[PDB]
Each structure stands twice: as structure tokens, then as C-alpha cells.
């Protein structure tokens, strides 16, 4: 059924699975028209599909041309997400296909379920966790490939960089969620934290800086401090 | 006007005949129901005084044979039987009538209720939902499950309603996923109407027989079937005008006839609020919406 804090270690077992986040598929800037009305103008988006055990990210870029001439775009976006996830699955060798897909928003359950009727042995599950995958467009290299895209496109990343050489998936997912939560609560400060001194740099093939073990502790501490603060700055405590 | 003679009434029982009910006491001299209008199906049903568990009953058409009821003390129920000897039956009924031991189907002349609830119900289709082919009449009870239900355990005693499932390949054309799921016109008109039911009269027949089994026996899977068939029409952008008009009338009479105290278990909030207020046909069920608001405004 639903995914929550009690069955949290299931993510890191040996059953292949993906999270699907659709929060950045349909993105608009709202603006005034000459006549003083309001209009939306869409910008490129992406489906965030992630293997939490390996870190493989399948970033499907949603080009604005897909919305041309379409009505009810927030509802179309959930079905477009589901069409693209199901195609991704179909494109994978059977032994690489997921046993479960966990959607971060319950409104994706029906669309994905309907697109996956051919896969009756793939479980589509919601979650009660409040995962910060919306902050994925706060990651500079991801935001870049999306905004530069002139056509539909799939790009593959490892969101854990090389972390798994040194830490468990459980720890790697926890660092990722912490960085993303931080980027979501106060993007500026989180970004200030990350590239504090030029000696630590981002390798061409990575998303995040190359920190030592000892430097990731300092960073993780600064991200927690940030997150507890903004919670103060917000509820005054 | 036809007759169903009862060998006797050895156990105290509430007897229903279509939308009416009456009480019989243990060993009261009682030998039947007379003046049953010809030309409709009927249902005669039973709730024992000692065990309100298991309502049960028989669907039947007097044009198809001479039927009677005799209590079976082994199986502990009033059973319907067919008497094949025409003049033995006439002679049995005539003596019951002369001794004035039969109650009279009290049809008020103004009253089209039973016609309106059974307009499209036909015995031949009832016998295909309720498979028991040695008999011309069909037994149903509270606990019988549906074919779809058993997919999720005795097949001989199932209700073989037409399986409807909105998240199925039958219902959803490859490459039309969003289209077919939000507008069920394909599944209604091509799959069900043209393919499976052949015409809208057969579809309405099943819908009406589901509602009646739900109301008279509190058959939970019948109620699921009734709501499912309603929702499929309401969620279809394209429905023949004549089907919508008839549906409004069909539902109006079901809702009119439902006991006011059974509405909590037998009416599905989501389905009704969706059909009346959100669906494509939200504006096509004027009579049904007016009675539903004046009678069950709580549910909505
Ligand atoms: C009560 O009506 C009947 C009772 C008994 C019989 C037969 C002779 N078993 C037939 C009937 F039509
Ligand atoms: C079919 O015979 C009857 C039907 C209904 C009643 C009352 C009005 N409950 C009494 C009957 F004798």
C-alpha cells in the first residue's frame, strides 16, 4: 500500500523500484497581458524518475511544444507523466524493469495505473512521506539541461555522484533528501553553503561538489542548521 | 390474473411480492397470493421471523408455467416448484380461492410502480445471470456473490452480472488511455452496448434487476453492479438522447421506491454526487436530481 516512515528500509532492498515525481512537469510563469488580464506562459519541465538504491535518475525533459493547443494542462500533465513513465518501462529489458513505482503525489496513481495495465505485476504505490524532489530544478546542471532543451529529450544522471563507493544507499538517500529539503526551504542559503570555498569543486561528470567525508559532515550540519532555522524564521520559535 | 398456491405456511415468515410485504404467523391457514398481474416478471421473497439472516426469494413469470410454494423442513426454506399437470393446478387453486385462503396482490389501479421498475427486465435474461437451468424461476438471496466479486467461492450459486471495471484493458484502448478513462463513451457504446448487451433495453434490464436484488435482498454485489452501470452512462460524454431520457425515468422510480431507512447502505455517495453534479450528464437527469435532492439531501 502506501509508503511511510515505518517501511522506510524497503527502498534500499534488492527489489528494483522507482520514485516518480511530477511536480516540475508543467511549469508556468504568470503575467499580465496588454489588456490588463492575466496569462500563463509555460517553460520547459521534467519528470523526475529515480532509483533510490542505485541513484540512477531518468530525467525526461518536457518541452513546452507538448502543451500547444491543449486544454486542462494540469490534468494533461499527470497523463503525460504516466505515458512517459510507461514508455520508459517498456524500453527497459525485463530484468531492469521496476517491481514497484512509488508516486510522490496521489493524483498520479490513476493515470499511471491506467498506463501500466499491461504490467499487472508492477505495483503502483503512493507515499505518506513529504519528499523534496520538487527542488530538483534547484540543481544547476539539471535546471540547465531542461531550460536549454529545444525538443523532447531523456537525460540520464546519477544523483548520488560517486557517493556509493563510500556510503550505503540508505545514507546516500538521506544526504540527498537533506540537500533537497534545504534547497526547497531557502534556495539561496543552501546554495551559498554548497560552494563556500573554490578548493572544493564539482567534477564535470557530477552534480554536487567533491567533498571529503569530513567535509560532508560540515555541510550536512550546515544544511540541518538552515532547515531548523527557516522553521523558526517561519513559526517564530 | 395468475396465482401462486402455497402448500402451507409452517413457519412464521414475512412474505414479499414485488414492492409489497405482509406477515404470516406460524401455521396460520395461508395458501397463496392471487390476482398477480400478467405480463411482468415478479419476485416473491421471504424473511423468516426467527432468522432475519438471509432474505431470499424467487424471480418468476406466470406465463412460463404454473408455480407454487411448499416449505421444505429439511432445508428450512420456502421453495418454489413447478406443477406440470395443468388441471391439477387449476383444481388446487380453485379450492384455495373458494375457501378464501389466498391474499390478493393489491395493485392500485393508478399505480405503475412495478411496471416502471421492471420495464426492461425479462425472465430469459434473469436466467442467464442466475444459472440454474432445470427451473423456469430463479432463486436469489442476501449472501450470493457476483462473478466479478469471486475474481477478487462456489460458481453454481453466483450472480453472473456483466463485469464492468473502469481500470481494465476491456475499458481502455491502447493509446487512448487518458481519453477513454475520462470519457467512457467507447466502453459504453462499443464494448458494452454494441458488443455485449446488443442494445440499451438489455443493459437497462440488467441495471434494473441489480437494483431490485439490492433493495429486496440487500445483496451487496448487486448494489455494486447497479452503481457501476449508472456511473458508466454518466461518465460517457456521448450517449443517445433516448437512453438518457429513459435513464432519468428508471432512476426516478428506483429512488422513489427505495425505503427511506435503507438509503445509508444502498446508496453510494461518490457515484451519486459525481453523476448528478460532476459528470458529463450532470444536466441530463432532471427528475432523478429533483427527487434525490428533496428526499436524500443529506447524502449530497
Ligand atoms: C400449493 O400448490 C400446489 C401444491 C401441491 C402440488 C403438487 C401436487 N405437489 C401442486 C401445487 F400446485
Ligand atoms: C399480497 O397481499 C398483501 C399485500 C400487502 C398487505 C399489507 C398492505 N401489508 C397485505 C396483503 F395481504
Amino acid at each position: 500500500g502506501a509508503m511511510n516512515s515505518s517501511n522506510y528500509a524497503e527502498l534500499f532492498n534488492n527489489d528494483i523500484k522507482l520514485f516518480v515525481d511530477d511536480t516540475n512537469v508543467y511549469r508556468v510563469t504568470v503575467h499580465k497581458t496588454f489588456e490588463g488580464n492575466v496569462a500563463t506562459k509555460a517553460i520547459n519541465g521534467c519528470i523526475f524518475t529515480l532509483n533510490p538504491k542505485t541513484g540512477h535518475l531518468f530525467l525526461k525533459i518536457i518541452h513546452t511544444s507538448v502543451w500547444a493547443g491543449q486544454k486542462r494542462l494540469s490534468q494533461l500533465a499527470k497523463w503525460k507523466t504516466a505515458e512517459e513513465v510507461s514508455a520508459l518501462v517498456r524500453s527497459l529489458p525485463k530484468e531492469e524493469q521496476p517491481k514497484q513505482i512509488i508516486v510522490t503525489r496521489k493524483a498520479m496513481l490513476d493515470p499511471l495505473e491506467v498506463h501500466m495495465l499491461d504490467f499487472p505485476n508492477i505495483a503502483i504505490r503512493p507515499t505518506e512521506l513529504r519528499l523534496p524532489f520538487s527542488a530538483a530544478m534547484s540543481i544547476d546542471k539539471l535546471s540547465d539541461v531542461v531550460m536549454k532543451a529545444t525538443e523532447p529529450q531523456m537525460v540520464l544522471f546519477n544523483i548520488y555522484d560517486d557517493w556509493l563507493d563510500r556510503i550505503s544507499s540508505y545514507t546516500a538517500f538521506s544526504r540527498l533528501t537533506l540537500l533537497l529539503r534545504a534547497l526547497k526551504t531557502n534556495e539561496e542559503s543552501a546554495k551559498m553553503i554548497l560552494l563556500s570555498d573554490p578548493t572544493i569543486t564539482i567534477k564535470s561528470y557530477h552534480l554536487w561538489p567533491s567533498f571529503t567525508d569530513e567535509q560532508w559532515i560540515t555541510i550536512e550540519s550546515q544544511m540541518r542548521d538552515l532547515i531548523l532555522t527557516e522553521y523558526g524564521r517561519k513559526y517564530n520559535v | 390474473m395468475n396465482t401462486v398456491p402455497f402448500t402451507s405456511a409452517p413457519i412464521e415468515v414475512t412474505i414479499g411480492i414485488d414492492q409489497y410485504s405482509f406477515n404470516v404467523k406460524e401455521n396460520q391457514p395461508f395458501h397463496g397470493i392471487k390476482d398477480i398481474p400478467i405480463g411482468h416478471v415478479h419476485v416473491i421473497h421471504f424473511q423468516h421471523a426467527d432468522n432475519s439472516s438471509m432474505r431470499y426469494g424467487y424471480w418468476f413469470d406466470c406465463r412460463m408455467g404454473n408455480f407454487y410454494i411448499q416449505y421444505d423442513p429439511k432445508d428450512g426454506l420456502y421453495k418454489m416448484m413447478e406443477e406440470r399437470d395443468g388441471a391439477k393446478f387449476e383444481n388446487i387453486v380453485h379450492n384455495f380461492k373458494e375457501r378464501q385462503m389466498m391474499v390478493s396482490y393489491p395493485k392500485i389501479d393508478e399505480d405503475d410502480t412495478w411496471y416502471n421498475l421492471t420495464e426492461f427486465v425479462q425472465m430469459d435474461k434473469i436466467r442467464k445471470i442466475v444459472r440454474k437451468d432445470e427451473n423456469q424461476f430463479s432463486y436469489v438471496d442476501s449472501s450470493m456473490t457476483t462473478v466479478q466479486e469471486n475474481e477478487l467461492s462456489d460458481p453454481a450459486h453466483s450472480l453472473n452480472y456483466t463485469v464492468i471495471n473502469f481500470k481494465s484493458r476491456e475499458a481502455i484502448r491502447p493509446g487512448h488511455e487518458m481519453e477513454d478513462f475520462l470519457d467512457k463513451s467507447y466502453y459504453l457504446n462499443t464494448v458494452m452496448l454494441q458488443g455485449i448487451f446488443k442494445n440499451s433495453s438489455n443493459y437497462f434490464g440488467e441495471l434494473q434487476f441489480a437494483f431490485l436484488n439490492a433493495m429486496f435482498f440487500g445483496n451487496y454485489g448487486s448494489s455494486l453492479q447497479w452503481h457501476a452501470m449508472i456511473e458508466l452512462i454518466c461518465s460517457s460524454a456521448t450517449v443517445p438522447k433516448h437512453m438518457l431520457d429513459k435513464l432519468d425515468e428508471i432512476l426516478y422510480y428506483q429512488i422513489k421506491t427505495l425505503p427511506e431507512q435503507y438509503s445509508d447502505i444502498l446508496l453510494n455517495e461518490r457515484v451519486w454526487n459525481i453523476c448528478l453534479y460532476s459528470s458529463f450528464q450532470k444536466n441530463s437527469l432532471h427528475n432523478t436530481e429533483k427527487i434525490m435532492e428533496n428526499k436524500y439531501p443529506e447524502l449530497l
Side-chain angles (χ1 to χ4, degrees), chain A, chain B residues 1-151 154-300:
Chain A
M3 209 273 293
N4 56 47
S5 297
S6 304
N7 58 38
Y8 184 74
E10 190 176 11
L11 296 171
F12 313 112
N13 71 20
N14 290 111
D15 279 11
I16 293 181
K17 49 178 82 64
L18 306 164
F19 283 110
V20 174
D21 191 79
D22 68 323
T23 61
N24 287 309
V25 167
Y26 173 54
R27 312 206 278 152
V28 290
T29 61
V30 175
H31 65 83
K32 279 287 193 62
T33 78
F34 184 83
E35 289 79 15
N37 310 133
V38 178
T40 52
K41 176 181 175 310
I43 57 160
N44 286 349
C46 61
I47 302 158
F48 181 98
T49 303
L50 169 71
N51 189 325
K53 182 85 187 219
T54 55
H56 285 199
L57 173 63
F58 301 87
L59 190 79
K60 178 72 189 221
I61 303 185
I62 297 308
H63 183 262
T64 56
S65 51
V66 313
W67 317 123
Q70 303 306 307
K71 279 73 170 74
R72 299 202 35 90
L73 299 178
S74 68
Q75 170 184 277
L76 178 58
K78 303 175 198 294
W79 291 89
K80 181 49 173 179
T81 300
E83 186 188 10
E84 292 290 347
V85 169
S86 63
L88 167 58
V89 170
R90 287 174 207 282
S91 78
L92 292 169
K94 190 190 190 198
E95 74 270 10
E96 290 179 53
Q97 285 175 347
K99 297 290 178 155
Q100 298 176 7
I101 306 169
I102 304 160
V103 296
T104 63
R105 302 197 295 178
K106 308 187 199 78
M108 283 290 322
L109 290 174
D110 272 356
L112 193 49
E113 168 162 1
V114 167
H115 265 282
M116 304 281 296
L117 293 165
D118 304 326
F119 294 98
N121 300 355
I122 300 178
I124 309 305
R125 313 178 41 201
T127 171
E128 302 295 358
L129 303 178
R130 43 274 190 159
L131 290 166
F133 295 154
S134 66
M137 292 297 99
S138 300
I139 304 168
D140 286 319
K141 290 193 182 184
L142 301 184
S143 184
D144 284 348
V145 69
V146 175
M147 291 311 290
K148 293 186 194 295
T150 52
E151 37 177 330
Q153 184 189 349
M154 160 84 81
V155 186
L156 301 186
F157 297 86
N158 191 317
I159 209 165
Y160 297 153
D161 285 358
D162 65 338
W163 296 347
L164 289 188
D165 292 338
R166 314 195 50 90
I167 67 187
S168 63
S169 301
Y170 183 108
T171 304
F173 192 76
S174 294
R175 185 182 285 165
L176 174 70
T177 55
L178 168 69
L179 295 169
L180 288 175
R181 181 61 64 195
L183 288 158
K184 190 175 180 166
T185 319
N186 182 324
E187 177 174 21
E188 182 212 352
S189 309
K191 295 183 117 161
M192 286 183 63
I193 295 169
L194 283 151
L195 18 148
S196 202
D197 51 294
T199 45
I200 304 154
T201 59
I202 304 171
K203 295 301 165 291
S204 60
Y205 41 96
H206 284 173
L207 306 168
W208 319 94
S210 290
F211 288 112
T212 73
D213 299 7
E214 294 314 295
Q215 296 172 335
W216 269 120
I217 305 294
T218 307
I219 289 289
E220 288 161 313
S221 154
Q222 281 162 22
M223 291 300 186
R224 297 192 185 91
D225 290 344
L226 183 168
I227 290 164
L228 145 75
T229 311
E230 279 300 326
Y231 180 106
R233 277 175 94 254
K234 193 236 266 196
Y235 303 88
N236 299 304
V237 153
Chain B
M1 309 304 276
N2 271 132
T3 299
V4 183
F6 272 52
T7 290
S8 61
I11 67 172
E12 198 155 290
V13 62
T14 302
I15 297 176
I17 187 56
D18 311 341
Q19 72 275 36
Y20 315 94
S21 73
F22 56 106
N23 289 321
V24 179
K25 300 297 170 302
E26 175 187 298
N27 290 317
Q28 171 176 349
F30 171 82
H31 288 285
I33 317 205
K34 73 163 161 193
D35 302 312
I36 301 169
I38 303 175
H40 312 108
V41 305
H42 298 290
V43 62
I44 183 173
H45 36 306
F46 297 95
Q47 183 127 233
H48 296 182
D50 62 8
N51 172 57
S52 49
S53 312
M54 213 60 62
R55 281 174 267 172
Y56 64 99
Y58 304 90
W59 288 92
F60 71 87
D61 186 330
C62 280
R63 298 171 285 189
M64 288 177 58
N66 301 314
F67 308 115
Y68 60 108
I69 295 281
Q70 185 150 130
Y71 184 74
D72 169 22
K74 182 165 159 72
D75 292 345
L77 73 184
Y78 291 95
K79 295 187 168 169
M80 173 155 293
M81 308 200 261
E82 180 171 359
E83 174 48 59
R84 68 171 284 119
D85 189 350
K88 233 164 197 260
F89 188 81
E90 296 171 22
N91 190 245
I92 277 312
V93 171
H94 176 265
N95 171 92
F96 287 148
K97 278 189 192 174
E98 279 302 301
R99 308 225 301 139
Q100 296 190 43
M101 321 237 66
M102 308 207 163
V103 295
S104 206
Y105 188 97
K107 174 188 199 306
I108 306 327
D109 313 83
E110 168 196 49
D111 176 28
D112 274 337
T113 292
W114 190 243
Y115 171 84
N116 288 326
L117 298 162
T118 66
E119 180 171 0
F120 299 96
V121 180
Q122 307 269 351
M123 207 55 235
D124 89 296
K125 304 304 207 311
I126 282 175
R127 302 188 58 198
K128 298 184 200 307
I129 292 165
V130 188
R131 321 195 148 293
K132 185 165 198 294
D133 292 10
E134 61 277 15
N135 297 334
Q136 297 278 287
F137 52 86
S138 293
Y139 171 95
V140 183
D141 67 30
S142 298
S143 77
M144 286 173 47
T145 48
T146 65
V147 165
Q148 161 177 92
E149 276 188 310
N150 296 137
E151 300 168 359
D154 190 3
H157 224 44
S158 288
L159 287 170
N160 305 266
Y161 293 120
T162 300
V163 175
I164 301 174
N165 171 6
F166 296 137
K167 297 191 289 183
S168 77
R169 177 54 74 219
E170 293 67 23
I172 296 296
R173 281 171 305 182
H176 296 260
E177 287 83 1
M178 181 191 190
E179 184 193 0
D180 282 352
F181 180 75
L182 299 182
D183 179 9
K184 306 184 173 282
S185 300
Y186 151 74
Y187 189 40
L188 166 64
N189 286 301
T190 301
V191 183
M192 296 279 169
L193 288 178
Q194 161 178 346
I196 291 190
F197 288 97
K198 303 312 172 184
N199 61 59
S200 53
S201 298
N202 288 340
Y203 185 100
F204 289 139
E206 189 164 319
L207 192 154
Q208 283 177 322
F209 178 63
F211 165 79
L212 292 165
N213 289 321
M215 180 174 62
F216 288 133
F217 311 111
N219 190 261
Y220 181 80
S222 290
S223 182
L224 286 177
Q225 185 62 15
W226 172 57
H227 280 94
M229 305 185 73
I230 294 167
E231 181 165 8
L232 173 55
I233 292 172
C234 289
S235 304
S236 286
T238 309
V239 184
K241 309 90 173 52
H242 80 267
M243 272 194 52
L244 294 176
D245 287 337
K246 189 63 72 155
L247 180 65
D248 194 24
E249 293 295 330
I250 284 172
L251 296 174
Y252 174 83
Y253 280 107
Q254 295 168 340
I255 299 304
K256 191 179 178 74
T257 309
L258 249 196
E260 308 73 32
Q261 304 294 279
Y262 283 53
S263 39
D264 41 295
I265 50 176
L266 289 171
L267 290 176
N268 193 271
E269 189 174 279
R270 175 194 69 88
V271 178
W272 280 100
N273 281 269
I274 270 70
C275 295
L276 290 182
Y277 301 119
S278 320
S279 77
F280 291 101
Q281 308 302 345
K282 66 187 170 301
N283 295 320
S284 303
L285 306 172
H286 306 126
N287 295 3
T288 296
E289 174 181 291
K290 185 171 288 302
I291 191 175
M292 274 283 295
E293 293 187 353
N294 273 277
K295 191 178 182 192
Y296 302 120
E298 321 94 34
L299 178 81
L300 311 163

